[PDB]
Amino acid sequence: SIWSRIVNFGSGWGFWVSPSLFITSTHVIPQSAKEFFGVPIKQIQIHKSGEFCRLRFPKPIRTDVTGMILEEGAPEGTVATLLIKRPTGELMPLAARMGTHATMKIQGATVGGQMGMLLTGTTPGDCGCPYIYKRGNDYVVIGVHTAAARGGNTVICATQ
Ligand SMILES: *[C@@H](CC(=O)OCC)[C@H](C[C@@H]1CCNC1=O)NC(=O)[C@@H](CC(=O)[C@@H](NC(=O)c1cc(C)on1)C(C)C)Cc1ccc(F)cc1
């Protein structure tokens, strides 16, 4: 259902928020591609906020999916789900308690997002996978995976 919206993208993953909106991590988008999903790159309207990368296609690409709510992170303390897809195809939902929103230094670079704590991990191929949580009856996507700290269970969710 939601898992079909996570797709192989460059060195990582990306997520269909809607038929026309695809988000991923700046570290993962292929910089030399001439088209994405058959659409020439010039027709694709791309925005970048640090490690958050959103792609707006001129025409619906995934007509089978419904638009999902995209917000800038989650209320502090929200237990979200990092929806990890592995190249083996295995689905690995990882619970993460979301922490402070901040402008953070990560390997010298500035990135905007939200810290989280894996509850009970993540690997270099996992960047771009989405963080999601359920509010009422609505699913809400809050960002994409971009980093995880060594010597700890902290993960970084890049946000808009
Ligand atoms: C995914 C992207 C990737 O592979 O990039 C290579 C071009 C990858 C996922 C993490 C790898 C280990 N586990 C993961 O979940 N992301 C990265 O490698 C980013 C860098 C890191 O994750 C480092 N983490 C940190 O520096 C850090 C600091 C804090 C508070 O938390 N984490 C190491 C653990 C490797 C790539 C990146 C992201 C954003 C940047 F601004 C610079 C670099």
Residue numbers in the entry: 4 to 123, 133 to 172
Could you give the paper's own sentences about this structure?
The protease plays a crucial role in viral replication by cleaving the polyprotein into individual nonstructural proteins. HuNoV proteases are cysteine proteases structurally similar to picornavirus 3C-like proteases with a chymotrypsin-like fold. Their active site features a catalytic triad with histidine-30 (H30) as the catalytic base, cysteine-139 (C139) as the catalytic nucleophile, and glutamic acid-54 (E54) as an acidic residue which orients and stabilizes the conformation of H30 (15). The substrate binding pockets S1 to S4 in the HuNoV protease, which accommodates the P1 to P4 residues of the substrate, are in the cavity between the BII-CII loop (beta strands BII and CII, residue 102–117) and the DII, EII, and FII beta strands of the second beta-barrel.
To understand the role of R112 in ligand interaction, we determined the crystal structures of the R112A mutant of GII-Pros complexed with rupintrivir as well as enzyme and inhibition kinetics. Surprisingly, there is little change in backbone conformation between the respective rupintrivir-bound WT and R112A proteases of all GII strains. The BII-CII loops in the R112A protease structures adopt an open conformation even without the R112A sidechain present, with the conformation of the rupintrivir pose remaining the same as in GII.4-Pro Sydney and GII.3-Pro WT structures. In GII.4-Pro HOV R112A, the rupintrivir-bound protease backbone shows the moderately open BII-CII loop position seen in rupintrivir-bound protease structures from other GI and GII strains, indicating that this is the most stable rupintrivir-bound conformation for HuNoV proteases. These highly similar backbones between WT and R112A mutant proteases, especially in the BII-CII loop, further confirm that the main cause for the lower potency of inhibitors against GII-Pro is the steric clash and subsequent unfavorable interaction of the P2, P3, and P4 residues with the BII-CII loop, rather than steric hindrance by the R112 sidechain alone. Interestingly, in contrast to elevated B-factors in the BII-CII loop between apo and rupintrivir-bound structures, the B-factors remain marginally the same between the rupintrivir-bound WT and R112A structures. However, our assays with R112A mutants of GII-Pro reveal that the R112A mutation does not significantly increase the potency of rupintrivir against GII-Pros. In GII-Pros, but not in GI.1-Pro, the change in enzyme turnover rate outweighs the change in Michaelis constant, resulting in a significant drop in protease catalytic efficiency. Similarly, we posit that the R112A mutation likely hinders ligand displacement by the protease, resulting in increased affinity to the protease for all ligands.
